[PDB]
Design a protein around this ligand. Structure first.
Ligand SMILES: OC[C@H]1O[C@H](OC[C@H]2O[C@H](OC[C@H]3O[C@H](O)[C@@H](O)[C@@H](O)[C@@H]3O)[C@@H](O)[C@@H](O)[C@@H]2O)[C@@H](O)[C@@H](O)[C@@H]1O
Ligand code: CA
Ligand code: CA
Ligand code: CA
Length: 338
């Protein structure tokens, strides 16, 4: 029972990482630092549990987390990293779609206004990484911005938001997507006076949000090109290459990188749920999530239920919250697909 596994991990995560004010600590050792974007993804994990169970017990924990983020972020929701605001805004819109709780919509509305301010024509378009890095346009600040815009379009049907989604996605595809594989390069910035793309950094979460944005744009327009884009990127995830070792999504370390795998699995799974996906691709994608979930469960989880950065080995020491969230996201995705 994969839902039973996910619920066990939800409980272990909440029990080990909950700190004051309804937020979640950086690790299970000596660090109580508040990580804004990690806590945003804990909200996503709590939403995963709510959708699977229908258990209203998740709702007060979600609300306490939303309000605790405001306090620990300095009595505000704005953050210097634009991608951080995008992650929280996405989770807030997800919550509003399921609960109609206007408090989440108001936060999302604020964060969308800030996200749109990061856009510029530097490097041809794209949302900046930070409010003060006008020249650094990163996949992690554009993939999520498109997803953000698409959720808002589903909710408010403002034509300007669909235009934003299309413009963000098409800049991302034209700039940071490898035309041969569909995988996503990390960023473009000025180095020694000229624009350079970091092609060495190919992370699971960047192709993850590209897949997620393409899937949502296909749903919002019906244009097959978006589905073709998503299938190509997801097929490269499955086939041997940069992001897998022995068919398992690879170790990307702890800290921020601990969260990368879970984000890819979330949006990969959403593509596997698209009704227009061909049967053979759906089977291949479902089998890939199962293989990863089985690997983590049997090889990578501690007996208490903590996941490490390598899904194929148990962590012997500190477990960052980000790393743990990727494990819970994997199990929730597996339970969703059964
Ligand atoms: O070794 C450096 C980092 O490499 C890997 O992270 C890749 C990303 O690094 C940057 O983003 C990191 C964090 O920056 C802010 O705090 C905020 O935006 C956070 O949300 C963000 O995660 C940036 O260059 C991104 O474009 C890269 O993709 C991981 O291994 C990290 O853990 C590691 O510290
Ligand atoms: Ca429970
Ligand atoms: Ca209920
Ligand atoms: Ca305030």
């Amino acid at each position: 029972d994969w839902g039973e596994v996910a619920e066990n991990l939800q409980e272990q995560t909440y029990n080990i990482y909950l700190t004051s004010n309804g937020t979640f600590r950086q690790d299970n050792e000596g660090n109580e630092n508040f990580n804004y974007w990690w806590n945003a993804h804990m909200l996503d994990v709590l939403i995963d549990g709510y959708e699977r169970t229908g258990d209203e017990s998740y709702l007060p924990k979600m609300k306490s987390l939303l309000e605790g983020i405001e306090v620990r972020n300095g009595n505000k929701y704005e953050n210097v990293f634009i991608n951080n605001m995008e992650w929280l805004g996405i989770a807030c819109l997800r919550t509003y779609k399921l609960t109609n709780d206007q408090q989440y919509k108001e936060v999302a509305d604020l964060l969308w206004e800030e996200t749109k301010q990061g856009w510029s024509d530097v490097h041809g378009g794209g949302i900046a990484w930070k409010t003060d890095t006008p020249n650094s346009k990163n996949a992690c600040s554009n993939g999520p911005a498109a997803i953000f815009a698409l959720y808002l379009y589903e909710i408010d049907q403002d034509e300007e938001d669909l235009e934003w989604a299309k413009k963000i996605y098409h800049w991302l595809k034209d700039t940071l997507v490898d035309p041969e594989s569909g995988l996503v390069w990390d960023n473009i910035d000025y180095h020694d006076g000229e624009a350079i793309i970091n092609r060495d950094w190919i992370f699971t979460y960047n192709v993850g949000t590209y897949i997620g944005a393409a899937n949502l744009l296909h749903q919002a327009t019906g244009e097959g090109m978006y589905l073709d884009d998503a299938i190509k990127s997801a097929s490269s995830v499955v086939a041997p290459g940069e992001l897998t070792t022995g068919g398992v999504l690879k170790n990307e370390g702890q800290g921020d990188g601990g969260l990368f795998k879970g984000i890819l699995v979330r949006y990969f799974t959403q593509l596997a749920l698209n009704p227009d996906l061909p049967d053979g691709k759906r089977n291949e994608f479902e089998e890939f999530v199962l293989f990863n979930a089985e690997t983590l469960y049997h090889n990578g989880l501690t007996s208490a239920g903590l996941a490490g950065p390598n899904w194929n080995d148990e962590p012997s020491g500190r477990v960052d919250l980000s790393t743990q969230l990727s494990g819970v996201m994997l199990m929730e995705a597996k339970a969703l697909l059964e």
